[PDB]
Amino acid sequence: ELKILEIIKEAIELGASDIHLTAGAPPAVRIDGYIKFLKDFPRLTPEDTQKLAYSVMSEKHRQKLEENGQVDFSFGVRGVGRFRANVFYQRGSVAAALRSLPAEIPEFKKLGLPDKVLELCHRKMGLILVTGPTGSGKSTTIASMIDYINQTKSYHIITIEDPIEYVFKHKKSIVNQREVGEDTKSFADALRAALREDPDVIFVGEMRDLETVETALRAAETGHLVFGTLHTNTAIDTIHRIVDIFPLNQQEQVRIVLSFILQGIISQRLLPKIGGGRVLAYELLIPNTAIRNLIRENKLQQVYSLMQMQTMNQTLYKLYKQGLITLEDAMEASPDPKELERM
Amino acid sequence: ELKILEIIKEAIELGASDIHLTAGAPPAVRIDGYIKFLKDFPRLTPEDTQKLAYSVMSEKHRQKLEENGQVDFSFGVRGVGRFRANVFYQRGSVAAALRSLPAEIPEFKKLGLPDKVLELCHRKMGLILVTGPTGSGKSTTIASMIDYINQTKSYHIITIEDPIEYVFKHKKSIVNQREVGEDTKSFADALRAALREDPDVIFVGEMRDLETVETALRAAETGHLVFGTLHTNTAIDTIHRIVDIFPLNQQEQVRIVLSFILQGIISQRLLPKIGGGRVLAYELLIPNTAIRNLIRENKLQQVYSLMQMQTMNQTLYKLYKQGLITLEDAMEASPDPKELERM
Amino acid sequence: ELKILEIIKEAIELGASDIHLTAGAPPAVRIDGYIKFLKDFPRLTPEDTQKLAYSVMSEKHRQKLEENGQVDFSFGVRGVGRFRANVFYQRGSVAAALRSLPAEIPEFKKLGLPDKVLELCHRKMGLILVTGPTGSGKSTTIASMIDYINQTKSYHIITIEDPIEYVFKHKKSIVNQREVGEDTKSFADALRAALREDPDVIFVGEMRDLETVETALRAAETGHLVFGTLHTNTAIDTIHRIVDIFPLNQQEQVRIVLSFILQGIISQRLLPKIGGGRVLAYELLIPNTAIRNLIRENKLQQVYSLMQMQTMNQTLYKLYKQGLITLEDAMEASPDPKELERM
Numbered sequence A, B, C: 001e002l003k004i005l006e007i008i009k010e011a012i013e014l015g016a017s018d019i020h021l022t023a024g025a026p027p028a029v030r031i032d033g034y035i036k037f038l039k040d041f042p043r044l045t046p047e048d049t050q051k052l053a054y055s056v057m058s059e060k061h062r063q064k065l066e067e068n069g070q071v072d073f074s075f076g077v078r079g080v081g082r083f084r085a086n087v088f089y090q091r092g093s094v095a096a097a098l099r100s101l102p103a104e105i106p107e108f109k110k111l112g113l114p115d116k117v118l119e120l121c122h123r124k125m126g127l128i129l130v131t132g133p134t135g136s137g138k139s140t141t142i143a144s145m146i147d148y149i150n151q152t153k154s155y156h157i158i159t160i161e162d163p164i165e166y167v168f169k170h171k172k173s174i175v176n177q178r179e180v181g182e183d184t185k186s187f188a189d190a191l192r193a194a195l196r197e198d199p200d201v202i203f204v205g206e207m208r209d210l211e212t213v214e215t216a217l218r219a220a221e222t223g224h225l226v227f228g229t230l231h232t233n234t235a236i237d238t239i240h241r242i243v244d245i246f247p248l249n250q251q252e253q254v255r256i257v258l259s260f261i262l263q264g265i266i267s268q269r270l271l272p273k274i275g276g277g278r279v280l281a282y283e284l285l286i287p288n289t290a291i292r293n294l295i296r297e298n299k300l301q302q303v304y305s306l307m308q309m310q311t312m313n314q315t316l317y318k319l320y321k322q323g324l325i326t327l328e329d330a331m332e333a334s335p336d337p338k339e340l341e342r343m
């Protein structure tokens, strides 16, 4: 009757995006964006959604569900695909929310980026940051480039994700992915060991934290490709905001190292298309022998002057004049209202 | 003799609004708005009201009762209903004050609002703030609209309350409520996870804090209905006061986003009626294609001009001329003495 | 079939720097800095790389691999040498990465370099850069020359390593080795103090960082032998790439200093031999009274013209025509395909 394994069964049979559990009702599934209860067999679930979720979570999580009130992880049913969970305490009762998790990475061209980006995958070392606010598909972007490298290069790529969003497959390069919580205790020692595990390209999952950044750099400056990601909105925001988490005693010193090992900043945002709702906008900065010196000498909005690689607003004008995004959706995601409408 | 469970017994038997404990007397109950001690059995309670309260509170509260001098939570006697507590140190001694939390939800019509409000519940996304000073029944209002959605729409509503005022019941939508203190550590991470728990409508319980607001927006502008609530008195106060908690570096940029994802502001206040004392007054602003542009260009009391959706004073004239509120109770709650009495 | 002992067998036979296991593929080995799967016998390894690594680790480690998600240790196969392991949890699965500890120091002749190199050890001061990609034995090279000086000269040598690869023994010279992490906080202050500790020969461990380079120079130009090492591939790459990490305000000024204190650049790579897999290829530039002026006046590929001390491709033709490396392994490691095959 009430076996998680079998509520997933009727979830992808009904062609589902999500499953949702709660105490007072029977198991629910989202189809299309409307929610229907498949009372079909699962009954109005007891207080013992407890037992159901508990059966998916490792020991490491069912501890963490007591410390805080929620956990965020990913498990696989070898039967179908892998999922992304989120168990949480509700009204003294347990409840979860399982998503579908992409099985194919998308090929790089369908993304809507130039090739001077794909070109970054050919570097020998440095930082490649892919910033952007949650649900801007930065993983989607990363996943692409990394895979491109997976096929193209004889490499040993290593990713320290939270959680593993895409599974990588087996080509020319050999790919270790380490989910946090599951397979390491923290981004901290997870990276720090990565640095000894003899890697080619390292993917520091998120750089929230001073110590992470620290080595993430120390790793890029030392023979490896370091793909980082963040939550800043523009290029010059990013490179402010990573230097802003240092003690300013030496703060300068990073700006310099950064203006040698910075190899690409790509801020992103996902928008509603005129068609099927799927279109991406971006700002793109790949440092050339010129831009380097600017950053060295702190002179930043002097780099904003020099962006024409390509500003954010600029990739909205080139997007709206082709009739893909509304004159009102893009005067919304755009940092500066001023730098367009003139266009 | 002195069992909490049994003091609640004689509390709803006597038909009570409140129970009150203190050290120097016996257990007290409010009936009607006068307080009588049911010395009936409970004796002049010792210093060990300690034991009585201690028996209701989770570990999480009896810690917090040491950090500060008080705690604010809610527990349930399945035997009758649920209650709202408030244990607090007094004169080196313990004391509490238990209310009855309600047991429906009122149907939206009994409230005294128009249906252009209830229409908000049909939006696809955005902010709907329901401001108003404590004991103006903003949870009451909320609870209504949310429940309206609970029945009408096939939805996954999530609320992050403090405390849970109304329990939601089980219809077309599936409803998680998360009491803070009890089920999460802070409005902060409680929301921040809600954003992952695949929600349709989110209810950020109060918007006191810069970081809360931040995501509350970021969630509205991204496909969800975000009900907020505050303590401001008029519409233009609200939309000043949320922008006023930002750093003005970018302050402008919120005003804009706000004039696209603002979908309704409803300030409220509760007044004494000529009959049973129960009548509500409100100010109502639902942005149309015109009002949008005003807020975009900072031009605010130009929206005050344009209010006739409907001003506060205005919903006092239409209230007193029908003979429900006194000429002196409403020149009291009204922001501006000027804009009436002329009427 | 799947015996660790025998995957090491085929690892040093093919002439390997590293072995790498993972779940979704067959055992991998790095040769030269490219990764190839010897599907030869070991099959697409199961989830039971578990069993393989488990067979190397003491009890003390297989405990620690549960506490954290990784462990870093060292075991010996008495059959060959000793290794450096790093087992770590990956995607719910085990994985490892074994390197190759020589703990001997090899006598300089077995290396396969001329004596005009060994002659550098007789200089009074300058930079001696030993560039080359990970697993090209640059420490092996270094260690040699340093030891040669250890026995030959009455000196105080000091190395700032990460980690200490070879232990130096006690002869005519007195040898301090400073492991980073263990015995100092950073290459930064570790060097910076080495400059006061009265040294004869200083070995700056890697030159990733603008400040390191700075002093590493300032030390060479002031009475000491400064052995540096990098990750560049050819000579002219090296001397671009260290000047490239300076601000170009003065950038010129290093090129000059460099064309006085540059004493030898030796780029390296390790290749699979026709016999036991152990053969090294190199490019060699020891500046004479002529080459100095060229670098002074920026004129670089004019030095490339003047290399015949000896080009990289050149040390592949003199290697393949003797029948030690394949016509296809060396048209792989070679920077330029053009400058050979004609030969």
Ligand SMILES: Nc1ncnc2c1ncn2[C@@H]1O[C@H](COP(=O)(O)OP(=O)(O)O)[C@@H](O)[C@H]1O
Binding pocket: B102, B106, B110, B111, B133, B134, B135, B136, B137, B138, B139, B140, B141, B165, B270, B278, B279, B280
């Ligand atoms: N029209 C009405 N019908 C029934 N109850 C009302 C009405 N107006 C006000 N009340 C009462 O006022 C009280 C305070 O409101 P409540 O929503 O609990 O607080 P808040 O102002 O903090 O949101 C409630 O107990 C509620 O029942």
